[PDB]
Design a protein around this motif. Structure first.
Motif, PDB file in Angstrom:
ATOM      1  N   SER A 232     -32.252  36.182  -1.329  1.00 19.10           N
ATOM      2  CA  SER A 232     -30.842  35.462  -0.733  1.00 19.10           C
ATOM      3  C   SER A 232     -30.728  34.098  -1.435  1.00 19.10           C
ATOM      4  N   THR A 233     -29.374  34.073  -1.885  1.00 18.90           N
ATOM      5  CA  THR A 233     -29.008  32.873  -2.671  1.00 18.90           C
ATOM      6  C   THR A 233     -27.507  32.742  -1.891  1.00 18.90           C
ATOM      7  N   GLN A 234     -27.207  31.376  -1.969  1.00 21.34           N
ATOM      8  CA  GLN A 234     -25.894  31.352  -1.679  1.00 21.34           C
ATOM      9  C   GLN A 234     -24.631  32.115  -2.047  1.00 21.34           C
ATOM     10  N   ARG A 235     -25.002  33.015  -2.881  1.00 22.37           N
ATOM     11  CA  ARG A 235     -23.855  33.858  -3.320  1.00 22.37           C
ATOM     12  C   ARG A 235     -24.304  35.322  -3.362  1.00 22.37           C
ATOM     13  N   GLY A 236     -25.286  35.503  -2.784  1.00 22.91           N
ATOM     14  CA  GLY A 236     -25.585  36.963  -2.337  1.00 22.91           C
ATOM     15  C   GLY A 236     -27.102  37.292  -3.088  1.00 22.91           C
TER      16      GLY A 236
ATOM     17  N   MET B  93     -24.787  35.902 -11.343  1.00 22.06           N
ATOM     18  CA  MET B  93     -24.825  35.095 -12.754  1.00 22.06           C
ATOM     19  C   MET B  93     -23.571  34.698 -13.023  1.00 22.06           C
ATOM     20  N   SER B  94     -22.593  35.769 -13.055  1.00 21.25           N
ATOM     21  CA  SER B  94     -21.234  35.461 -13.610  1.00 21.25           C
ATOM     22  C   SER B  94     -20.632  34.341 -12.628  1.00 21.25           C
ATOM     23  N   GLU B  95     -20.706  34.530 -11.425  1.00 20.19           N
ATOM     24  CA  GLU B  95     -20.173  33.374 -10.232  1.00 20.19           C
ATOM     25  C   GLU B  95     -20.932  32.164 -10.583  1.00 20.19           C
ATOM     26  N   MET B  96     -22.306  31.965 -10.883  1.00 20.81           N
ATOM     27  CA  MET B  96     -22.875  30.649 -11.218  1.00 20.81           C
ATOM     28  C   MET B  96     -22.281  30.126 -12.401  1.00 20.81           C
TER      29      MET B  96
ATOM     30  N   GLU C  12     -18.921  28.456 -11.655  1.00 16.98           N
ATOM     31  CA  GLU C  12     -18.919  27.473 -10.694  1.00 16.98           C
ATOM     32  C   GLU C  12     -19.791  26.290 -10.856  1.00 16.98           C
ATOM     33  N   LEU C  13     -20.588  26.287 -12.257  1.00 19.49           N
ATOM     34  CA  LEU C  13     -21.415  25.207 -12.258  1.00 19.49           C
ATOM     35  C   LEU C  13     -21.094  24.395 -13.541  1.00 19.49           C
TER      36      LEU C  13
ATOM     37  N   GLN D  53     -23.918  18.631 -15.839  1.00 21.70           N
ATOM     38  CA  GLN D  53     -24.516  17.948 -14.659  1.00 21.70           C
ATOM     39  C   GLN D  53     -24.975  18.923 -13.413  1.00 21.70           C
ATOM     40  N   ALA D  54     -25.381  20.140 -14.060  1.00 20.20           N
ATOM     41  CA  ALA D  54     -25.799  21.043 -12.970  1.00 20.20           C
ATOM     42  C   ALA D  54     -27.177  20.626 -12.333  1.00 20.20           C
ATOM     43  N   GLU D  55     -27.418  21.115 -11.071  1.00 20.99           N
ATOM     44  CA  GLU D  55     -28.716  20.563 -10.437  1.00 20.99           C
ATOM     45  C   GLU D  55     -29.570  21.579 -11.147  1.00 20.99           C
TER      46      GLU D  55
END
Length: 118
Positions: free
Chosen positions: A8-12, A45-48, A51-52, A56-58
């Protein structure tokens, strides 16, 4: 590394790690269920990538993106090895779409990394 598991990830859900030898290898139902896991990875992957911030990504988000990128590349190889073997018109169409989605997400990943790598 570890064999692929679903996380599980915060996006699915994503299925990341080394692919078992039977994944996307010869039931159309089974191949479709596996193909859906590829598409779920591509969507996250596309969402990240949308959105990143490349610079400056974590680190943890970058780690997940790298595991997705690596797994999706392995998934692409299986998709392309599978296509010649399938005669089902609908599954062939589905494989071709997923393949284009992969090539598009890898192109977007390259752009993200260029920002990241100057």
């Amino acid at each position: 590394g570890p064999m692929a598991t679903t996380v599980s990830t915060q996006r699915g859900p994503v299925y990341i790690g080394e692919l078992p030898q039977d994944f996307l290898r010869i039931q159309i139902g089974k191949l479709r269920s596996e193909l859906e896991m590829v598409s779920g990875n591509v969507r996250v992957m596309s969402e990240m990538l949308t959105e990143l911030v490349p610079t400056q990504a974590e680190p943890a988000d970058l780690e997940l993106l790298q595991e997705l990128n690596r797994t999706c590349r392995a998934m692409q190889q299986r998709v392309l090895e599978l296509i010649p073997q399938i005669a089902n018109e609908q599954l062939t169409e589905e494989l071709l779409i997923v393949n284009d989605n992969l090539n598009n997400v890898f192109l977007r990943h390259e752009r993200f990394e260029r920002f990241r790598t100057g």
